[PDB]
Structure 1
Amino acid sequence: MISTPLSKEFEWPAKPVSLELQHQVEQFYYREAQLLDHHAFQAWFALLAEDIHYWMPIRTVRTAREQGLEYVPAGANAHFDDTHATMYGRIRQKTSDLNWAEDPPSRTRHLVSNVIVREMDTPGTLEVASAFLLYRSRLERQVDVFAGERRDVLRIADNPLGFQIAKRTIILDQSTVLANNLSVFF
């Protein structure tokens, strides 16, 4: 369900999807991560649909009775809140050779697991949750580890990967961002 609270578990379908569909979605994600982890930024950006909304909300620390305030809501400040146009600009920056936070470039690994797929009411459209571990290291000794969950809307697509990303929401398992920046894509 696209507007399930991020504090709430994913609304998986009564029974899991077919093996074939699980494999296609996983294989898509592994190819996406290859592109990112090998800094294929133009090729990665081609996977973003023209109507993409890519968002990563801020997470706050709350005691029991104010737990519904954990997530800073849509329409307020956020870590990412992007369209196809702004993501394009980010990609121009990343491929410019003038992005000093990425020059020299980070070494990343996007491990993809816990993939749960839901078929939506439009044929060719999926809602997918997955867990990630993003390892980033750069320069001599810097290491940042990010973990969390991605909830996507994927659309079947005529490209060589067979999908585009129509929506991406990233749950990051941090409140204070412990890295010095978010100069990598999730």
Structure 2
Amino acid sequence: SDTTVREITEWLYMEAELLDAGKYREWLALVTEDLSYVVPIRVTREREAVTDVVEGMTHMDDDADSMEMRVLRLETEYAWAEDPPSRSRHFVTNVRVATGDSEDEFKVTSNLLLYRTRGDVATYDVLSGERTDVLRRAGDSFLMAKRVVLLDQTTIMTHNLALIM
């Protein structure tokens, strides 16, 4: 690819920079009208078994309307889960860019280490996962058509998933 790597990689850093800054509405300018943002459930199974990932159920399964509600909720001044806001850092590493099912689409895989902290108590949360995105072209930048955050946990180590990954 090259230079599309430089451009997708810097998109993923700008997306993270918006998310850790609390600018969710500005983040929503990314994403596509047919967005699919899903966070699968995982369960401990043996190596033999076909798969780890639960089918039919999810931690978060948004389209663009439902994702717009999620941001709409946070723009209200009664979003207690985040109204003294979290301190998050999205650590986007291991970026792997590869061509898409169509032209101008790219399957963009990253490793995420989300670091979450909540107000003055001396504890922190760490979510580790792998996002598998589909970045469409839109103008001289990209738009997110789909994301699958597959976390490295079965029992999730945060009290809620109020942060976008």
Same topology, TM > 0.5: yes
Deviations 1:119-150 (A, max 9, x none): 12422111111111111111112411011100
Counterparts of 1:114 and 1:69, CA distance in 2: 23
Residue 30 of structure 1 and its aligned partner are, at CA, apart by: 0.5
SS in 1 for 2:159: coil
Q: Provide structure 2 residue ranges, at least 5 long, that are not aligned to the other structure.
A: none
Q: Provide structure 1 residue ranges, at least 5 long, that are not aligned to the other structure.
A: 1-16
May I ask how many residue pairs the two structures share in their alignment? 164
Normalising by structure 2, we get a TM-score of: 0.95
Structure with the higher helix share, 1 or 2: 1
Counterparts of 1:173 and 1:34, CA distance in 2: 23
Counterparts of 1:99 and 1:32, CA distance in 2: 22
Stretch of structure 1 that moved more, 113-122 or 129-138: 113-122
Is 1:143 the equivalent of 2:97? no
**Which stretches of structure 1, 4 residues or longer, exceed 4 Å deviation after superposition?**
none
Query: Which residue of structure 2 lines up, in the alignment, with residue 103 of structure 1?
Result: 83
Residue 70 of structure 1 and its aligned partner are, at CA, apart by: 1.4
Structure with the higher strand share, 1 or 2: 2
- Among 63, 67, 74, which residue is 2:46 paired with? 63
Query: Which residue of structure 2 lines up, in the alignment, with residue 174 of structure 1?
Result: 153
Stretch of structure 1 that moved more, 132-141 or 28-37: 132-141
Normalising by structure 1, we get a TM-score of: 0.84
Percent of residue pairs bearing the same amino acid type? 39
Counterparts of 1:157 and 1:104, CA distance in 2: 35
Deviations 1:77-110 (A, max 9, x none): 1001110000000001111121111020001101
Query: Which residue of structure 1 lines up, in the alignment, with residue 134 of structure 2?
Result: 153
Query: Which residue of structure 2 lines up, in the alignment, with residue 33 of structure 1?
Result: 16
Q: CA RMSD in A?
A: 1.2
Is 1:54 the equivalent of 2:33? no
Counterparts of 1:88 and 1:28, CA distance in 2: 20
Whether the 8 Å CA contact 2:100–2:134 is kept in 1: the answer is: no
SS in 2 for 1:101: coil
Counterparts of 1:163 and 1:47, CA distance in 2: 8
Is 1:129 the equivalent of 2:112? no
Residue 64 of structure 1 and its aligned partner are, at CA, apart by: 3.4
Residue 35 of structure 1 and its aligned partner are, at CA, apart by: 0.4
